[PDB]
Design a protein around this nucleic acid. Structure first.
Length: 184
DNA sequence: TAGGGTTAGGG
């Protein structure tokens, strides 16, 4: 396949105890050709860890699978998520289900239309907030964007580069005030 | 509900 394996792969959380490679495949093959399908197990006990991965031949097929939520596998509602790489999985909050992104390093003259013209393609935007110092009114160089669907956030943050108001910016899942403090 | 013997040499 032309597109990277990491972007063709979904984490499937909350599997029934009973789900196997074969039953997971039988379900998710409805939305495309699977190049990989695995239920993770504890080595010695071989018991399911309750999650697995499915990988499609194309990202378009991944998108079709996410568009078909909610998914019931072997009688249990499961939780498919964009697969976060092992490296990125080390970061605080990498696996949270959130609807808001932090957008860091935006120019002083960035306005909401700049953020819409990059982010609307990923999903329905509910809130845009370009952050200022409350007292001085000075722009602080970051914004928060809130979407309607956590998968919009997940599709965004697995990518490396994001161009807003002409220049790259860094985009991460939003951590709460207390989550920021616990990550320090 | 976050990865499968899948992450820093030897010059």
């Amino acid at each position: 396949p032309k597109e990277p394996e990491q972007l063709r792969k979904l984490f499937i959380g909350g599997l029934s105890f009973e789900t196997t490679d074969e039953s997971l495949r039988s379900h998710f093959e409805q939305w495309g050709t699977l190049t990989d399908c695995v239920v993770m197990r504890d080595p010695n006990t071989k018991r399911s860890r309750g999650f697995g991965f499915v990988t499609y031949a194309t990202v378009e097929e991944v998108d079709a699978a996410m568009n078909a939520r909610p998914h019931k596998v072997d009688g249990r509602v499961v939780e498919p998520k964009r697969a976060v790489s092992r490296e990125d999985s080390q970061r605080p909050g990498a696996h949270l289900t959130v609807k808001k992104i932090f957008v860091g390093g935006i120019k002083e003259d960035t306005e909401e239309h700049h953020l819409r013209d990059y982010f609307e393609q990923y999903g329905k935007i509910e809130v845009i907030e370009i952050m200022t110092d409350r007292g001085s009114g000075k722009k602080r160089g970051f914004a928060f964007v809130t979407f309607d669907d956590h998968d919009s956030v997940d599709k965004i943050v697995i990518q490396k580069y994001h161009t807003v108001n002409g220049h790259n910016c860094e985009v991460r899942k939003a951590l709460s005030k207390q989550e920021m403090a616990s990550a320090s």
